[PDB]
Design a protein around this ligand. Structure first.
Ligand code: TDC
Ligand code: TDC
Ligand code: CL
Ligand code: CL
Ligand code: CL
Ligand code: CL
Ligand code: CL
Ligand code: CL
Ligand code: CL
Ligand code: CL
Ligand code: CL
Ligand code: CL
Ligand code: CL
Ligand code: MG
Ligand code: MG
Lengths: 195, 203
């Protein structure tokens, strides 16, 4: 079939959903595309290059709250950004593991720069804005990964696992997300006061 | 060599450090131990069973702050517990990935039950106590996984930059992620406290 970048990514994402990250291979990608491996090699040099690209394209296609709305608070931005990031990570099997494989791509520079600058324009030092942003990202990746890799008992644990199965993990995520945001606000608002 | 449980695990952890999780195999374990594959199979059925066991043993051996001290605040417990969990996950190559491959095994049940009961004995409902312990777990595992997968990716290929990102990467690379971790940990804890203290008040 067609092997422009867009069609290769389409096929890879389809395969990802079928196999998972570990079972995804360039050999199986070649098969899905109806092509010989050396043909695929001209387009995709190895699994790592493939995964680097998927990490970028999954956000490009499906993470629609990368940027704050005009006039939006930093609190509401981190919240909306985290929900959107989570949704994008959940969209494909082992999506969180696909993301972890890499740091911001050149295609993502402008976006992540704007995110960092936005936090600084709302009172954070670059360092404290970064720590906020990284905490949200790491909490969210953790919440998603635990979901994805889960794809006699004592009483509380029993009922915990009962609770922690009630939904897909969204409840514990949203609650933790609020705790995180409020903790950041307490820090920022204290200035030089002992807090 | 010796193939009691403790010895198989010792050799597997040693191998994990050598190869990382993707590169660890039962074939390579057999070689390390000086035995044939069907011999190893009697002891260890497959890679998954092996990893299950590693995930448990890594915590058993190296996660020293599983339980609160007598009289300890819930805040201080979560702090000390997270620091310990992080250290244990960082101790072996791809440790967080090894951990993620499972939920509490029987041998852990009682530790985690004691953790949940302790939160409830300090004013949390089971639900809110669990959300707290979970958020700590998720934040910590995410932070370690990013650090470890970043290490792995670098040995496959090298890593222009806008100024804040540059500065942010220089800041992130200045240690192993510990500063960012400890700062985010305090934010999370204080957020839990604010929520707990509110009771039924709008907050
Ligand atoms: C600022 C930053 C970010 C990310 C990141 O990995 C990163 C890093 O690895 C080193 C230094 C800085 C950053 C994100 O992954 C990302 O997920 C992302 O790419 C991203 C994006 N592309 O829109 C985000 O939404 C951000 N958000 C989850 C807080 C976060 C931003
Ligand atoms: C409560 C709980 C925990 C964990 C966990 O995986 C889990 C789950 O998968 C479902 C429901 C509840 C839990 C932990 O992994 C663990 O890391 C853990 O086993 C653990 C331990 N065994 O000591 C911890 O220290 C805990 N801490 C990091 C918050 C956390 C506790
Ligand atoms: Cl083509
Ligand atoms: Cl294209
Ligand atoms: Cl595309
Ligand atoms: Cl491959
Ligand atoms: Cl707003
Ligand atoms: Cl939606
Ligand atoms: Cl023996
Ligand atoms: Cl033994
Ligand atoms: Cl042992
Ligand atoms: Cl194997
Ligand atoms: Cl204390
Ligand atoms: Mg990232
Ligand atoms: Mg766990």
């Amino acid at each position: 079939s067609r092997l422009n970048r867009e069609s290769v990514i389409d096929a890879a994402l389809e395969l990802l959903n079928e196999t998972g990250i570990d079972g995804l291979t360039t050999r199986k990608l070649a098969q899905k595309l109806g092509i010989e491996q050396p043909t695929l090699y001209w387009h995709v040099k190895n699994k790592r290059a493939l995964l680097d690209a998927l990490a970028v394209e999954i956000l490009a296609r499906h993470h629609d709250y990368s940027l704050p709305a005009a006039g939006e608070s930093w609190q509401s931005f981190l919240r909306n950004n985290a929900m959107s990031f989570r949704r994008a990570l959940l969209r494909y099997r082992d999506g969180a593991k696909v993301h972890l494989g890499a740091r911001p791509d050149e295609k993502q520079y402008d976006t992540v720069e704007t995110q960092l600058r936005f936090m600084t324009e709302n009172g954070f030092s670059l360092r404290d804005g970064l720590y906020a942003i990284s905490a949200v990202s790491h909490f969210t990746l953790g919440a998603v990964l635990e979901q994805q890799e889960h794809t006699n008992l004592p009483p509380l644990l029993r009922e915990a696992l009962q609770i922690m199965d009630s939904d897909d993990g969204e409840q514990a995520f949203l609650h933790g997300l609020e705790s995180l945001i409020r903790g950041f606000e307490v820090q920022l608002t204290a200035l030089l006061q002992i807090v």
